[PDB]
Amino acid sequence: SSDFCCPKCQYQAPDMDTLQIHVMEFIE
Ligand SMILES: [Zn+2]
């Protein structure tokens, strides 16, 4: 995969930093 999918959503981010901004850390 040329993307990083959010394990909480069906949303996939083109970059891992973008995904990190999407999730904005976790409760885990
Ligand atoms: Zn998410």
Side-chain angles (χ1 to χ4, degrees):
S1 299
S2 184
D3 67 279
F4 293 91
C5 309
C6 180
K8 305 292 182 178
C9 314
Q10 58 173 149
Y11 183 87
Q12 56 190 151
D15 187 88
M16 56 179 174
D17 178 66
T18 309
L19 184 64
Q20 184 57 89
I21 300 176
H22 169 79
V23 294
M24 196 62 182
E25 301 190 75
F26 328 96
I27 319 175
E28 298 159 70

XYZ file of all heavy atoms in Angstrom:
226
model
N 0.837 -1.214 0.000
C 0.000 0.000 0.000
C 0.865 1.255 0.000
O 1.813 1.369 0.775
C -0.915 0.001 1.227
O -1.783 -1.120 1.222
N 0.533 2.195 -0.875
C 1.240 3.467 -0.949
C 0.590 4.481 -0.007
O 0.783 5.690 -0.140
C 1.224 3.987 -2.392
O 1.990 5.173 -2.528
N -0.172 3.972 0.948
C -0.892 4.810 1.892
C -0.833 4.195 3.278
O -0.254 3.124 3.471
C -2.356 4.960 1.465
C -3.127 3.654 1.562
O -3.014 2.820 0.638
O -3.857 3.457 2.555
N -1.414 4.892 4.236
C -1.544 4.393 5.592
C -2.988 4.544 6.056
O -3.474 5.660 6.255
C -0.602 5.139 6.544
C 0.855 4.884 6.285
C 1.572 5.699 5.424
C 1.508 3.827 6.895
C 2.911 5.466 5.179
C 2.847 3.590 6.653
C 3.554 4.417 5.814
N -3.677 3.424 6.202
C -5.079 3.433 6.586
C -5.234 3.558 8.101
O -4.458 2.980 8.864
C -5.754 2.154 6.098
S -5.476 1.796 4.346
N -6.233 4.321 8.530
C -6.513 4.487 9.952
C -7.209 3.244 10.495
O -8.245 2.842 9.976
C -7.397 5.718 10.195
S -7.791 5.991 11.940
N -6.664 2.632 11.562
C -7.232 1.414 12.158
C -8.554 1.671 12.884
O -9.135 0.771 13.488
C -6.155 0.967 13.149
C -5.414 2.210 13.498
C -5.440 3.068 12.262
N -9.015 2.911 12.822
C -10.260 3.305 13.466
C -11.317 3.657 12.424
O -12.487 3.843 12.755
C -10.026 4.521 14.370
C -8.936 4.328 15.412
C -9.337 3.309 16.465
C -8.262 3.170 17.531
N -8.645 2.209 18.596
N -10.899 3.753 11.168
C -11.764 4.262 10.116
C -11.525 3.502 8.820
O -10.702 2.594 8.768
C -11.452 5.738 9.875
S -11.289 6.741 11.385
N -12.239 3.886 7.773
C -11.928 3.404 6.435
C -11.095 4.455 5.707
O -10.817 4.340 4.515
C -13.205 3.088 5.645
C -14.146 4.269 5.496
C -15.309 3.966 4.573
O -16.407 4.493 4.748
N -15.074 3.129 3.571
N -10.705 5.488 6.450
C -9.887 6.565 5.918
C -8.446 6.110 5.751
O -7.875 5.480 6.644
C -9.935 7.778 6.857
C -9.168 8.982 6.350
C -9.770 9.905 5.510
C -7.841 9.192 6.711
C -9.076 11.003 5.040
C -7.140 10.288 6.246
C -7.762 11.190 5.410
O -7.071 12.284 4.943
N -7.866 6.439 4.616
C -6.478 6.127 4.352
C -5.724 7.402 3.986
O -6.188 8.195 3.167
C -6.378 5.082 3.239
C -7.074 5.481 1.946
C -7.160 4.344 0.948
O -8.091 4.283 0.141
N -6.205 3.434 0.993
N -4.584 7.611 4.625
C -3.789 8.806 4.397
C -2.600 8.494 3.500
O -1.976 7.444 3.635
C -3.324 9.394 5.721
N -2.270 9.406 2.572
C -1.173 9.208 1.616
C 0.197 9.148 2.288
O 1.165 8.651 1.706
C -1.263 10.436 0.703
C -1.987 11.461 1.507
C -2.949 10.701 2.373
N 0.275 9.649 3.511
C 1.530 9.667 4.247
C 1.288 9.366 5.719
O 0.218 9.663 6.254
C 2.211 11.024 4.095
C 3.601 11.045 4.695
O 4.566 10.701 3.984
O 3.729 11.400 5.880
N 2.287 8.786 6.371
C 2.159 8.382 7.768
C 2.060 9.588 8.695
O 1.398 9.523 9.730
C 3.324 7.482 8.187
C 4.697 8.097 7.972
S 6.031 7.000 8.496
C 7.463 7.932 7.959
N 2.698 10.693 8.321
C 2.620 11.913 9.119
C 1.219 12.491 9.023
O 0.669 12.989 10.003
C 3.653 12.946 8.652
C 3.573 14.250 9.427
O 3.868 14.248 10.640
O 3.238 15.291 8.821
N 0.634 12.385 7.838
C -0.732 12.820 7.620
C -1.694 11.981 8.459
O -2.630 12.505 9.063
C -1.108 12.715 6.131
O -0.107 13.363 5.332
C -2.468 13.346 5.864
N -1.438 10.676 8.514
C -2.251 9.772 9.315
C -2.115 10.111 10.798
O -3.089 10.051 11.546
C -1.844 8.314 9.073
C -2.708 7.277 9.799
C -4.138 7.318 9.288
C -2.123 5.882 9.644
N -0.905 10.478 11.209
C -0.644 10.857 12.590
C -1.443 12.110 12.959
O -1.903 12.253 14.093
C 0.857 11.084 12.802
C 1.239 11.401 14.240
C 0.799 10.329 15.223
O 1.526 9.369 15.488
N -0.390 10.490 15.783
N -1.617 13.002 11.993
C -2.427 14.200 12.189
C -3.915 13.838 12.210
O -4.703 14.430 12.953
C -2.155 15.242 11.081
C -0.679 15.644 11.084
C -3.038 16.469 11.263
C -0.298 16.589 9.964
N -4.283 12.858 11.392
C -5.652 12.358 11.338
C -6.063 11.757 12.684
O -7.060 12.170 13.277
C -5.787 11.318 10.212
C -7.073 10.543 10.225
N -8.275 11.024 9.754
C -7.321 9.286 10.666
C -9.196 10.066 9.915
N -8.668 8.988 10.467
N -5.285 10.788 13.159
C -5.571 10.127 14.431
C -5.355 11.076 15.605
O -6.134 11.076 16.558
C -4.718 8.848 14.622
C -5.098 7.795 13.594
C -3.236 9.155 14.531
N -4.312 11.903 15.506
C -3.920 12.813 16.580
C -3.704 12.031 17.877
O -4.402 12.236 18.873
C -4.965 13.919 16.773
C -4.457 15.097 17.589
S -3.062 15.931 16.807
C -2.698 17.196 18.021
N -2.735 11.117 17.829
C -2.430 10.215 18.942
C -3.623 9.313 19.252
O -4.605 9.296 18.512
C -2.002 10.992 20.184
C -0.773 11.860 19.957
C -0.209 12.427 21.241
O 0.431 11.675 22.004
O -0.416 13.630 21.501
N -3.534 8.541 20.328
C -4.576 7.573 20.644
C -4.822 7.521 22.146
O -4.167 8.218 22.922
C -4.173 6.176 20.145
C -3.335 6.196 18.896
C -1.954 6.134 18.985
C -3.918 6.298 17.643
C -1.168 6.169 17.852
C -3.134 6.332 16.505
C -1.759 6.268 16.608
N -5.765 6.683 22.554
C -6.042 6.466 23.967
C -5.434 5.129 24.386
O -5.795 4.543 25.408
C -7.565 6.460 24.247
C -8.254 7.566 23.446
C -7.834 6.655 25.734
C -9.764 7.563 23.574
N -4.501 4.657 23.579
C -3.874 3.366 23.796
C -2.365 3.533 23.943
O -1.927 4.137 24.945
C -4.205 2.443 22.622
C -5.694 2.172 22.472
C -6.075 1.709 21.083
O -5.721 0.574 20.702
O -6.741 2.477 20.363
Zn -9.210 7.799 12.171
